[PDB]
Amino acid sequence: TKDKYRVVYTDHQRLELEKEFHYSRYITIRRKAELAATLGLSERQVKIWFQNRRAKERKINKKKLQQQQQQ
DNA sequence: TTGTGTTTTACGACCTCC
DNA sequence: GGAGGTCGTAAAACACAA
Numbered sequence: 001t002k003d004k005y006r007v008v009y010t011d012h013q014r015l016e017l018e019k020e021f022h023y024s025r026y027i028t029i030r031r032k033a034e035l036a037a038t039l040g041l042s043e044r045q046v047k048i049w050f051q052n053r054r055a056k057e058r059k060i061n062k063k064k065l066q067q068q069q070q071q
Numbered sequence: 072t073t074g075t076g077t078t079t080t081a082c083g084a085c086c087t088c089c
Numbered sequence: 090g091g092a093g094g095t096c097g098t099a100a101a102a103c104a105c106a107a
Contacts, residue, residue, distance in 0.1 A: 026093095048081065
C-alpha cells in the first residue's frame with residue numbers, strides 16, 4: 001500500500017498516463033508493469049490512477065449529457 | 072488573502088468474475 | 090484460486106472571484 005497522505009504526480013508522469021489512457025481505457029497487466037517501471041510509480045498507483053481517470057470520464061460525460069439535455 | 076468550489080491521490084466496502 | 094471493477098468519500102492541492 002501507500003500512505004502519508006497523498007503525493008502529487010509530476011507533469012511528466014501525468015502526461016504519459018493520459019497518453020496511455022487515450023491508447024486504452026483499461027490497462028493490461030503487462031502494460032501496467034511497463035508503465036510503472038518506466039515512470040517510477042507502483043503498479044497499485046497505476047491501477048488506481050486508471051480507476052480514477054475512468055471516474056473522471058464518467059463525471060465529464062454526465063455533464064456533457066446535462067448540457068445537451070439543455071441545448 | 073480568504074473562503075469556497077473543484078481536482079487529484081488514496082482508501083474501504085462491496086461486487087463480479089468460471 | 091484473488092484480480093480487478095465501481096462508488097462515495099477524506100484530505101491535500103490548486104484555482105480564482107470577491
